[PDB]
Amino acid sequence: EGKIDEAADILCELQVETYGSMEMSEKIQFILEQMELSILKGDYSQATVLSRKILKKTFKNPKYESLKLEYYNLLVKISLHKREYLEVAQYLQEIYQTDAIKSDEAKWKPVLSHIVYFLVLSPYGNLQNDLIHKIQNDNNLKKLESQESLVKLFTTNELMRWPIVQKTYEPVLNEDDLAFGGEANKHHWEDLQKRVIEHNLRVISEYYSRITLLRLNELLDLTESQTETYISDLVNQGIIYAKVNRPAKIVNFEKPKNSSQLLNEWSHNVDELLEHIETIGHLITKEEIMHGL
C-alpha cells in the first residue's frame, strides 16, 4: 500500500518479543524483511544494529548456508549507501569456506569473482594481494585467471592501460547480481579511474627517481590541474610522499636524504667486499688444484 512506516512498526515489535526463542530460521527471516523496509526510509543506522544481531545468530546455528546468503543480500545494500568494500569483502570471505564443503562450483565461482572485482574498484591495492594469493584462487577457473592477469597489470601500469582494460573486458567489467545487490555501470567507471590514477603515481615513485610534470601529465593522460590534485591527495594521506618543484615543472619523488641511511649503506658495501675476498680466495685455490691435475 505504501505504508512503509506502519508495516515496520508492527514488524519491529514482533521480532524483539520473539527473540531468543521460536526457531533460528524464523527469527533471521524477520530481520531480512526489516532491513528491506529500513533501507528505503534512510534507516541505515537501524539496519547496522540489525546486522550485528543476525551475524551472531547465523554463527550460532549449525547448517545455516541459506541464512548466511540472506544476510549477505541485506549487507551489501546498506554498504551501497555508505561505501565500504571492507564490510562486504570480509563476510563473503567466511561464505567462501561454506561454499567449498556444501555447494557446487556453480554457487562458488560467481561469488569469488564478484569479491575480487569489488576489490579492483577499491582504491588501495594492498587488500587485493591477499585475496589473490589464495591456493585455489591462483589455480584454474576462467574468471580467476582473468583477475590474476589484472593483478599483474597494475604492477607494470604506466596508465595507458586503463582504456585497454575498459574496452577489452565487458563481462568482468559490468557483471552484477550474482552474490551482490549490483551497482551502476557508470559507477564502475568512476571507481576504476580513481584506482588506476593512484596506482600510476604509486609505481612511478619507485621506478623512476625524477619525472618532469609535463611528461607525467601526458602519462596519466590528464590535465595538469587534476594531476596536481590526484598527487596532492595521495601525498597528504601518506601512503607515499612526493614533492613538487613548481617553476621547473619537475616532480621529485626524493632519494636518500639522511646520514643514518648512508652509514648503514656503507657498512653494507664493506660487507660485500669482504665476502667477495673469501669466495674468491677458496674459488681460486680450487682452480689451481685442477690445473695441477
Binding site: 584454474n140 604492477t155 604506466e158 621506478y207 623512476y208 627517481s209 625524477r210 619525472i211 611528461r215
Partner: protein, 387 residues
C-alpha cells in the same frame, strides 16, 4: 635379417637353461615384426640397444617374458624399458592398455629390494601409474585437466629422496609439456634447460627424445627470454652433439638478426610463420632491450658504472624517442636494475648489479679491473707501512 632371432635366442639360452624360456613362437613372432635394420628386442643387456622400434603387437607375448626377464638379468632393465618403448613407438592407445595390466605390482612386499622410478630403473609401483597417467593425459586432453595432473606429479616428486633421478626426469618432461600446450615459451625455455641438464650426463637417452628437446629448445628460445637471446646458448648446448637435425642454423641466424634488428631478417631467421609465432609480437621489444643492455654493459666504462646517456641507449637500440621511453619504462619494472633513474636530468643513473655474459670479454675486462683494484689497495698499504 636373422639378427633379432639370433641375438635374442642365444642370449635367452645363455642366461637361463631352457625352462619355459626359449619360446619358438616368440623367436619367430619378434622375427616377423622387425627383421629390418631395426630389431624389436636383443635380449637382457641387448634390451638397452634393441627393444620396440615399431608398434609392438608382440605385447601380450612380452608380458610372459617380463615373467621370465628378472632371472635372465637384474633389477634395473625391467623398469627401464617397455614403458618408454610404447611411448616413442607412438602407441598411445596401447600405452594405456599396458598401464591397466601392470597397474602397481610386479614383485613388491616380501620380495623386498629397494625401488626407484621407471624409464631408468625398477620403480615405485605407484610412481609408474602416476607419472605416465600425466604424460598420456596431457597429450590427449585440455589444459585445465593438465594443471590438475601436474599438481599430482608435483606431490610424487616431493615425496621422495631424489636418489634414482628417474622421477625428476618425469617431472621436467611432464611440466615442459604444459608450457608447450599453452603459449609459454619463456616458462618452457627454463623447463627445457632443466630437462636437458638432468637428462644428458647420465645417458639413458633415445633419438626420439633428443629430437624433441633440441627442436623444442630452439622454438622456446626464440619464443621467449629474460636473460639475453644467444650468449647463454653459447654456454647452453643447442646442437653440441645432442642432435644437429631440424635446421639449428636458426640459433646463429637469431644472433645476426638481434644485432641488425631487421624485419626481413626476422622472416629469414627461421621461416615466415614460425618466426612470428604469435610469440614475437610481444617478444621483439623484450628481445630488443636485451641486445642493447648487454652491448653497452661491457663497453661504456671499463669499471662498469651506472651512468648512461639516454641518447646513446636510443642510438644503439635504433628506436624513436617516445618508443624508447615506453620500452625503458617496462624494463625498470622487470628488475635487475633499481637505484632510481632520473627521468629528468636525462640521467640513466640506475645501479650496477646484473650478471655479465660469457667467459670471453668477462676475462679481458676482469684483468683491467684487477690491476686497478690491486693498485688502489697497495697505495693505502704503502703509506700506512712507512709511518
Amino acid at each position: 635379417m636373422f639378427n633379432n632371432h639370433e641375438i635374442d635366442t642365444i642370449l635367452s639360452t645363455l642366461r637361463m637353461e631352457a625352462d619355459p624360456s626359449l619360446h619358438p613362437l616368440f623367436e619367430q613372432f619378434e622375427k616377423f615384426y622387425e627383421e629390418k635394420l631395426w630389431f624389436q628386442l636383443s635380449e637382457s643387456l641387448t634390451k638397452f640397444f634393441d627393444d620396440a622400434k615399431s608398434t609392438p603387437l608382440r605385447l601380450r607375448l612380452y608380458d610372459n617374458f617380463v615373467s621370465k626377464f628378472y632371472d635372465k638379468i637384474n633389477q634395473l632393465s625391467v623398469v627401464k624399458y617397455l614403458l618408454a618403448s610404447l611411448k616413442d613407438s607412438k602407441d598411445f592407445d596401447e600405452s594405456l592398455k599396458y598401464l591397466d595390466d601392470l597397474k602397481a605390482q610386479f614383485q613388491e612386499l616380501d620380495s623386498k629390494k629397494q625401488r626407484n622410478n621407471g624409464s631408468k630403473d625398477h620403480g615405485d609401483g605407484i610412481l609408474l601409474i602416476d607419472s605416465e597417467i600425466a604424460r598420456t593425459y596431457l597429450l590427449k586432453n585440455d589444459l585445465v585437466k593438465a594443471r590438475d595432473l601436474l599438481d599430482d606429479l608435483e606431490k610424487t616428486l616431493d615425496k621422495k629422496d631424489s636418489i634414482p633421478l628417474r622421477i625428476t626426469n618425469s617431472f621436467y618432461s611432464t611440466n615442459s609439456q604444459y608450457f608447450k600446450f599453452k603459449n609459454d615459451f619463456n616458462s618452457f625455455y627454463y623447463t627445457s634447460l632443466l630437462y636437458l641438464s638432468t637428462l644428458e650426463p647420465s645417458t639413458s637417452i633415445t633419438l626420439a627424445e633428443r629430437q624433441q628437446l633440441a627442436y623444442d629448445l630452439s622454438i622456446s628460445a626464440l619464443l621467449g627470454d629474460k636473460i639475453y637471446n644467444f650468449g647463454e646458448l653459447l654456454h647452453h648446448p643447442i646442437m653440441e652433439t645432442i642432435v644437429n637435425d631440424s635446421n639449428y642454423d636458426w640459433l646463429f641466424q637469431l644472433l645476426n638478426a638481434l644485432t641488425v634488428g631487421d624485419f626481413d631478417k626476422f622472416d629469414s631467421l627461421i621461416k615466415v610463420q614460425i618466426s612470428k609465432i604469435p610469440i614475437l609480437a610481444q617478444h621483439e621489444s623484450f628481445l630488443r632491450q636485451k641486445i642493447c643492455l648487454m652491448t653497452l654493459i661491457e663497453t661504456v666504462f671499463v669499471k662498469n658504472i651506472r651512468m648512461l646517456s639516454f641518447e646513446d641507449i636510443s642510438k644503439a637500440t635504433h628506436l624513436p624517442k617516445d618508443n624508447v621511453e615506453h620500452l625503458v619504462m617496462r624494463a625498470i619494472s622487470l628488475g635487475l636494475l633499481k637505484g632510481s633513474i632520473d627521468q629528468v636530468n636525462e640521467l640513466v643513473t640506475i645501479s650496477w648489479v646484473q650478471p655479465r655474459i660469457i667467459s670471453g670479454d668477462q676475462i679481458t675486462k676482469m684483468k683491467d679491473r684487477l690491476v686497478e683494484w690491486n693498485d688502489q689497495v697497495e697505495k693505502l698499504g704503502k703509506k700506512m707501512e712507512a709511518r
